[PDB]
Amino acid sequence: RTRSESTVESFFARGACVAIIEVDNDAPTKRASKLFSVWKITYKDTVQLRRKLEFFTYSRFDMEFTFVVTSNYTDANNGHALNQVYQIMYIPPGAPIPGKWNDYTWQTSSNPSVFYTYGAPPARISVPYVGIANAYSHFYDGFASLNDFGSLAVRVVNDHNPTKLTSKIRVYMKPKHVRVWCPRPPRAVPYYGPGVDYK
Amino acid sequence: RTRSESTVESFFARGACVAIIEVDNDAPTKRASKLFSVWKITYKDTVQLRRKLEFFTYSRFDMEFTFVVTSNYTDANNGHALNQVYQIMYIPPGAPIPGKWNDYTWQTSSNPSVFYTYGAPPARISVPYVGIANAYSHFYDGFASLNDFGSLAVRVVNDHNPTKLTSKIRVYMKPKHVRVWCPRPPRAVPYYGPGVDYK
Amino acid sequence: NQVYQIMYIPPGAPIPGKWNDYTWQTSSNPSVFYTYGAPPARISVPYVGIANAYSHFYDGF
Amino acid sequence: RFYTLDTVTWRKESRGWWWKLPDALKDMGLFGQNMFYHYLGRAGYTVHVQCNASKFHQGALGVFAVPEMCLANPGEKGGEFKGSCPVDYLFGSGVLAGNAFVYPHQIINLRTNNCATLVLPYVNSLSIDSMTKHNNWGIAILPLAPLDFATESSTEIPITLTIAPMCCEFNGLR
Amino acid sequence: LNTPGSNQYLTADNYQSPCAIPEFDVTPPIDIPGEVRNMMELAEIDTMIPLNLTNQRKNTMDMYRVELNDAAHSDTPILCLSLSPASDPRLAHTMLGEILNYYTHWAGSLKFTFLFCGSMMATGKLLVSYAPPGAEAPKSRKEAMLGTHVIWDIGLQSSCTMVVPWISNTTYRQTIGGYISMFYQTRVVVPLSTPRKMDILGFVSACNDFSVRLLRDTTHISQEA
Amino acid sequence: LNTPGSNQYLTADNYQSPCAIPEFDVTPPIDIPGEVRNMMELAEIDTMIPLNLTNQRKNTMDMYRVELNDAAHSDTPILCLSLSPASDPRLAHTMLGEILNYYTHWAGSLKFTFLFCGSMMATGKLLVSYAPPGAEAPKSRKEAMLGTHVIWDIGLQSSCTMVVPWISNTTYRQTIGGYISMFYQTRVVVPLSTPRKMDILGFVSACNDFSVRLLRDTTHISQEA
């Protein structure tokens, strides 16, 4: 035992990309012009973090989210565009999910939001323990894998611009203050779905 | 009773969008080319904040204003424009309201003003208690709903530019040091006008 | 504005072979994102040797 | 008190047995009545496994206490593992049976002992929870070694499972 | 390096701000009666329950009361209340329901007060029973008698107060827990020409242990999009 | 001046972050059994070795055991284990191997436990030898006898535990060290009609001095590109 770099905090608190969000600005032309996508915060999208968390039954940790936004000009000769401003809103568990770009959910009455300006250092937010139970449940035998975690929504708040722009937002989640309980053996078969089914 | 997140400060001190201001630069071409709009600071424009404040008769709080400016090129192929500078001026109660872009009210002899540069972090100002009475009056039975609060004016101070630009300013107001008196029951019917009329 | 990803590969880790391979997910490889126009990126790599000191000469197998 | 479940028989082709708690005790007299009459509850378990094997019998049994034994509700009799109905070597969760020893466990080697005991503390994400729609613990008995015996007598070794609740708490009478 | 949270406005941000009007003579406060520190003050105030929601008795005054003396009555629940203040329409419009509509999660005990408004000469008995969570509401007097219940006497006593304890596996449950029903016990007896159409009123309030977390938006009055 | 490390997101960065939900009522923790501080807790837990990897005995239950009584047996190693937990397939799938797969370097002693499952009346002797690192595994009983070895008796004793010491020039070696082999000593003797096909089980675990550094990614289950 003993020695550093082998602790639970060292094992779990590592930054990794967990989601990619595609947003547009205006001028659909021939595309759907998706202004937002919305992503439910979960650890099932990354195999490494999923395998690390499945090693235990109950866990408690805080989530630190880092957003990196990279914009691209679809047409090289559309003209210089004004600097883009992106709105990243955290949706707490139990809150309504946005369905339209200009709906009431984007008013940030109770949903935390951060505005990111292109060229600025990447946005960073910290989400504390938002679970309903005393610890997150990776396994539930009965009638809890969906341990809330809220969701993230990113949209462009710029005005109507004739030019076409596409931006990609990389979401990095770094767990903090990780505590684990009830050790479990590692997964030995490839994952199929969000459950424990095997083939 | 007891427990946090239920206090008056927690209930009221939440950021929300309360106003949207449209400004132009030059070259009307076919539009009115509104260089300023001016907005009277009030809580009647947002249903959530209005309902929260109507729960009590008298209240005292300080207002923190955050301005987010997003510019847009009306024509995609007008050419690169110089970085825009916006002037946001707070009009104290009882002060004259600007009527022209280059009138005497924009000289900031006694009206606080802040200059915002595009690409910079969003401007933030704090307005203390500017009421005339000892507390704001949400209800008045006699011969006080217009509890001053001053007003905000935003204009573009850039020189004559052939290119056409349109900018939108989002105003977020976060009450601070909120104290309330004389609790009142919640509103049960949709609002019609700035009064208490019901249908 | 261009964004560049600079990733440090620790000894014994796989070397990237494709732009969109698994090695760029930074599961255990430290990485820093640099934005054009920002001050130059700076990182510090401690002693990552296996022995007690780096060997500039080795006479043997 | 001590509650004894139905006796299972060990064969030479048995792939193992599994039980769920407090699912196995839902109909076990007073404890089952209390867990049915209350919306919330909390209680520990004491697991005793008895193997009625003679000195001439060969084999080993692996008793594992798995918290939240999710499988990819029989009740008293439980179920059996499948050779190729959870998979025995996959432990019902796609995990090699060798790593199943991470859970609290006991080894019943017929050449050393014929009984084993286990202490199961209350494990859950809540201080108190319903005793009916949630399975707090699972008991899995696996044939670590194939059953063999002298060519003299017997074909089936009886296996007795006794579970006794402890630290019982009940709230929300209905 | 540009990272989220740097040079960006955050809704839940908290730093110091420049003063627009420095050295301003702020009016000193005065001791205005009714100062409130916490929103839980409103939840502990008794609020009349709209109880009898019917098509005639909706958005009116007759809904707040239930007639307590029919001709031959019945052995069926005259009124039934569900322990879902943020979900039951009979309790969503109350002060407790309005407070809970702003918070996803809630915890603590509840208090229900029932008082009937009739003549002093009216005599009778009523049965008030509390159904534990997860149990169906009683459909008869015997079923109510099988569980936790109290006997309410019509006479010198005119008000009955019951407290529903906090029974939940989790510390806080979502605002998205048992039943309270009343039954006739023997009969309602009145003297000569005494009105046989007296009425009852219900009140709901929160206890001292009430607490909420994770403030959200309200459903009533929403037009902004 | 723009330099690397300024205004850029770093994977191994550590500063304070703005709170998305300030003054949130975080649920207090409870004493959940099985709290673990360090990943080395899992490495010290005994894990059954898949030992006999064969084409019939693969991804099944028969691989975990080796039959210990043939008809005439042989003077050859019945089973051989290599001291490469992160490289040997017989030890890569164990808990120690899975833990080591996440770390490039490792150090410390190892513990191997062998127990056989047969009848109490079975009597015999077995030879367990440890080959020093850099030495070929013995191919005969005499070669095993020439090195470090122990005599395991089949009888009242049913389990044998051996500890492999930490022998390496460097403080930590890569997860990319000797052999452990067992030999028949005299014979396996059983009484009348006693089964002559008893089985043995192997277990591997880490010692208290085990330590790893330079955490890496795992090989099992990788599809992201």
Place of tokens 């067992």: F182
How many CA atoms does the CB half-sphere of D109 hold within 13 Å? 18
CA distance C56 to chain A (A): 28
User: Nearest CA of chain A to the CA of E62: how many Å?
Assistant: 35
A:19-48 residues touching chain B, CB 8 A cutoff: none
Contact F24 B10 (CB under 8 A): no
Range of the domain at E111: 1-225
How far apart are the C-alpha atoms of F128 and B166, rounded to whole Å? 85
| Residue at token pair 């709230």 | D171
The CA R_g of chain C, rounded to the nearest whole Å, is 16
- F6 min Cα distance to partner chain D (Å): 42
Does C35 reach chain E within 8 Å, measured CB to CB? yes
Contact between residue A6 and residue F39 where contact means Cβ atoms under 8 Å apart? yes
Query: Could you tell me how many CB contacts below 8 A there are between chain C and chain E?
Result: 9
| Among candidates F33, F50, F193 on the partner chain, residue whose Cβ is nearest the Cβ of D121 | F33
The region that residue A119 occupies, defined by phi over 0 for left and psi between -120 and 50 for alpha, beta otherwise, is left
First vs last C-alpha separation in chain C: 50
**B3 vs E211, E215, E218: nearest CB:** E211
Cβ-contact B26, B33 below 8 angstroms:
yes
Sign of the Cα torsion B123, B128, B129, B131 reads negative
Angstrom CA distances, B16 to A107, B172, D16, F159, F164, stand at 6, 5, 61, 70, 65
Quick one: which H or E segment has residue A176?
Answer: strand A165-183
Contact B10 F25 (CB under 8 A): no
Give the CATH number for residue F64. Answer: 2.60.120.20
Which residues in chain B are closer than 8 Å to A120, comparing Cβ atoms? 121
User: Token pair of F38, please?
Assistant: 């360090």
Check F214 against C50: CB less than 8 A apart.
no
Phi, psi (deg, nearest 5) at residue B107: -80, -10
Q: Are residues B118 and A85, on separate chains, in Cβ contact within 8 Å?
A: no
Nearest to B160 by CA among B25, B37, B22, B30: B25
**Cα distance between residue F89 and residue F77, in whole Å:** 18
Nearest CB partner across the interface for D135, out of A58, A142, A184: A142
Instruction: Say how far apart CA A86 and CA A113 lie, in whole Å.
Output: 10
Pinpoint the alpha helices (H) of chain A: 8-12, 47-54
For residue D164, which phi and psi values (nearest 5 degrees)? -120, 120
Rounded CA-CA distance D49/D143 in Å is 13
Among E6, E13, E17, E208, most B C-beta atoms within 10 A, so best to mutate, is E17
Whether chain A has a CB inside 8 Å of the CB on E221: the answer is no
| Measured distance CA(E111)–CA(B14) in Å, rounded | 31
Q: Please report the sign of the dihedral spanned by the C-alpha atoms of residue F68, residue F70, residue F74, residue F80.
A: negative
Q: How far is CA D45 from CA D23, D120, F8, F44, in A?
A: 12, 5, 53, 26
* Selected residues 52-111 of chain B with any CB under 8 Å from a CB in chain A: 68, 70-81
Q: Do the beta carbons of residue F209 and residue D68 sit within 8 Å?
A: no
Where b means 16+ CB within 10 Å and e means fewer, F131-146 reads: beeeeebbeebebbee
Nearest to F26 by CA among E72, B186, C47, E213: E213
Residue with tokens 């199929």: A192
Percentages helix, strand, coil for chain C (3-state, rounded to 5) are 5, 20, 75
The Cα–Cα gap between F159 and F177 comes to: 24
Beta-bridged to residue B101, according to DSSP, are none
Question: Chain D partners of A144 at a C-beta cutoff of 8 Å?
Answer: 125
Which residue from D minimizes the CA distance to E170?
D126
Tokens of F105: 């370097």
CA count, 13 A, side-chain hemisphere, A189: 19
A179 touches chain F (CB under 8 A): yes
Give the closest residue to E49 by CA, choosing from E111, E94, E82.
Answer: E94
Contacts of A78 in chain B (CB under 8 A): 76-77
Q: What tokens appear for B103 in the block? A: 């009138």
Torsion sign (Cα): E188, E190, E195, E198: negative
CA–CA separation, A15 and C27 (whole Å): 7
Structure tokens at A163: 């030019």
Decide if D102 and A196 are in contact by the 8 Å CB cutoff: no
Residues in chain E: 225
Backbone angles phi, psi at F188, to 5 degrees: -115, 120
Residue B165 contacts by C-beta under 8 Å, 6 or more apart in sequence? A82, B24, B25, B71, B72, B73, B74, B81, B84
Structure tokens that stand for B157 in this block: 């101070």
Query: Is residue A118 less than 8 Å (CB to CB) from chain C?
Result: yes
Number of neighbouring beta carbons within 10 Å of residue E200:
22
State whether residue D93 sits within 8 Å of chain E by CB: no
Which of A76, A191, A62, A196 has its CA nearest to residue A138? A196
**Number of Cβ within a 10 Å radius of residue D156:** 13
Retrieve residue F163's tokens.
Answer: 């500890």
Q: Which of A147, A145, A135 is nearest to A180 (CA)?
A: A135
D151: its two tokens: 């060519």
Angle (nearest 5°) at CA F199 between F197 and F205? 170
Rg of chain F over all Cα atoms, to the nearest angstrom? 23
Integer CA distances (angstroms), B122 to B23, B68, B171, D29, F109, in order: 17, 5, 10, 69, 59
Q: Which phi-psi region, left, alpha or beta, contains residue F102 (left: φ > 0; alpha: ψ -120 to 50)?
A: alpha
Length of chain D: 174
HEC secondary structure over E134-195: CCCCCCCHHHHHCCEEEEEEECCCCEEEEEECCCCCCCCEECCCCEEEEEEEEEEECCCCCC
Does A177 contact chain C (CB < 8 Å)? no
HEC profile of chain B:
CCCCCCEHHHHHCCCEEEEEEEEECCCCCCCCCCCCCCEECCCCCCHHHHHHHHCEEEEEEEEEEEEEEEEEECCCCCCCCCCCEEEEEEECCCCCCCCCCCCHHHHCCCCCEEEEECCCCCEEEEECCCCCCCCEECCCCCCCCCCCCCEEEEEECCCCCCCCEEEEEEEEEEEEEEEEEEECCCCCCCCCCCCCCCC
Residue type, position D28, single letter? M
Q: How would you classify the pairing of strands C40-41 and F3-4?
A: parallel
Instruction: Report the alpha-carbon distance of residue F92 to residue B172 in Å, rounded.
Output: 58
Give contacts of E211 with chain B, Cβ < 8 Å: 2-3, 6
SS3 state at D109: strand
Instruction: Report the alpha-carbon distance of residue F159 to residue F155 in Å, rounded.
Output: 10
CA dist list (Å): E211 to A89, E110, E220: 26, 11, 22
DSSP states of D44-99: EEEEEEEE---TT-EEEEEEEEEET-------SS-EE-B----BTTTTTTT--GGG
User: Do strands D58-67 and E3-4 pair parallel, antiparallel, or not at all (unpaired)?
Assistant: unpaired
Is the Cβ pair C32, F6 closer than 8 Å? no
**Any D CB within 8 A of E170 CB:** yes
* Cβ pair D164, D46 in contact under 8 A: yes
Can you give the resolution of this entry in Å? 3.1
For tokens 């867990």, the residue is D35
A29-58 residues labelled b (16+ CB within 10 A) or e (exposed): eeeeeebbebbebbbbbbbbbbbbbbbbbb
Distance CA B193, CA B184 (A): 19
| Nearest in space to B6 (alpha carbons), one of E214, D71, E145 | E214
Residue B134 Cα distances to B62, B137, E37, angstroms: 13, 9, 18
Residue A57, H or E segment: strand A56-73
Numbers of helices and strands, H then E, in chain C: 0, 3
Domain residue spans in chain A?
Answer: 1-199
For D163, the enclosing helix (H) or strand (E) is: strand D157-173
Q: Could you write out the three-class secondary structure of chain E?
A: CCEECCCCCECCCCCCCCECCCCCCCCCCCCCCCCECECHHHHCCCEECCCCCCCCCCCCCHHHEEECCCCCCCCCCCEEEECCCCCCHHHHCCHHHHHHCCEEEEECCEEEEEEEECCCCCEEEEEEEEECCCCCCCCCHHHHHCCEEEEEEECCCCEEEEEECCCCCCCCEECCCCEEEEEEEEEEECCCCCCCCCEEEEEEEECCCCEEEEECCCCCCCCCC
CA E179 → CA E85, E147, E149, F114, distances in Å?
Answer: 11, 11, 12, 61
What is the length of chain B?
A: 199
How many residues comprise chain F? 225
Q: Give the 3-state secondary structure of residue D37.
A: helix
Give the integer Cα–Cα distance in Å for A185 and F94.
Answer: 10
Q: How many angstroms separate the CA of residue C29 from the nearest CA in chain A? A: 9
**Cβ B128–E19 below 8 Å, yes or no?**
yes
Q: CB–CB of A150/A92 below 8 Å?
A: yes
For residue D12, what is the DSSP state? S
Q: Which residues of C19-56 are buried (b: 16+ CB within 10 A; e: fewer)?
A: eeebbbbbbbbbbbbbbeebbebeeeeeeeeeeeeeee
Q: How far apart are CA A197 and CA A199, in angstroms?
A: 7
Breaks (C-N over 2.5 A) in chain D follow: 72, 84
If one counts every other C-beta atom within 10 angstroms of the C-beta of residue B113, the result is 16
CA atoms within 13 Å, Cβ hemisphere of A75: 12
D–E CB contacts, 8 A cutoff, strictly below:
29
Tell me if residue A108 falls in helix, strand or coil: coil
The size of chain C, in residues, is: 61
Chain B, residues 93-132, CB within 8 A of chain E, namely 112, 114, 120-122, 124-132
3-state secondary structure of D23: coil
CB count, 10 Å around CB of F51?
21
SS3 for chain F is CCEECCCCCECCCCCCCCECCCCCCCCCCCCCCCCECECHHHHCCCEECCCCCCCCCCCCCHHHEEECCCCCCCCCCCEEEECCCCCCHHHHCCHHHHHHCCEEEEECCEEEEEEEECCCCCEEEEEEEEECCCCCCCCCHHHHHCCEEEEEEECCCCEEEEEECCCCCCCCEECCCCEEEEEEEEEEECCCCCCCCCEEEEEEEECCCCEEEEECCCCCCCCCC
CB contact under 8 A, F17 and A135: no
Give the integer Cα–Cα distance in Å for E154 and E157. Answer: 6
> A58 pairs with which residues across the strands?
A137, A181
Q: Which residue type sits at F45?
A: I
Across the interface, do C25 and A15 touch by the CB < 8 Å criterion? no
Q: How far off is chain B from E91, nearest CA to CA, in Å?
A: 14
What are the tokens at E136? 């169906």
Count Cβ atoms within 10 A of the Cβ of residue E145 and give its class: 0-12 exposed, 13-18 middle, 19 or more buried: middle
Beta bridge partners of F212: F106
Q: Rounded CA gap, E43 and E48, in Å?
A: 13
How many Cβ atoms are within 10 Å of F191's Cβ, its own excluded? Answer: 11
CA distance B65 to B70: 16
Number of domains in chain F: 1
**E strand or H helix at D139:** strand D137-148
**Spatial separation of the C-alpha atoms in residues E36 and E44, rounded to whole Å:** 13
Give the closest of A48, A114, A179 to F218, CB-based. Answer: A48
Collapsed DSSP state (helix, strand, coil) of residue A9: helix
Handedness of CA F29, F33, F36, F37 (dihedral sign): positive
Q: Of F26, F102, F211, which is closest to A128 when you measure between CB atoms? A: F26
Obtained via which technique? cryo-EM
CB B94: neighbour CB atoms within 10 A? 9
User: How many other C-beta atoms are found inside a 10 Å radius of the C-beta of residue D1?
Assistant: 8
- The CA–CA distances, whole Å, from E30 to D88, E27, E33 equal 76, 9, 9
Report d(CA B61, CA B135) in Å as an integer. Answer: 9
Residue B31 φ then ψ, to 5°: -100, 170
Contact between residue D140 and residue D21 where contact means Cβ atoms under 8 Å apart: no
State how far the Cα of D139 lies from the Cα of B171, in Å rounded to an integer: 61
Token readout for F59 is: 């991804």
Q: Spell out which residues of chain C touch residue A71, defining contact as CB-CB under 8 Å.
A: 1
Take residue F212 and report the two structure tokens written for it. Answer: 């790893």
What gap in Å lies between CA A7 and CA E39, rounded to an integer?
43
Six-digit token string for E49: 């329950």
Helix (H) or strand (E) holding A24: strand A16-24
Residues 6+ apart with CB under 8 A from F175: F85, F86, F87, F100, F101, F103, F104, F105, F106
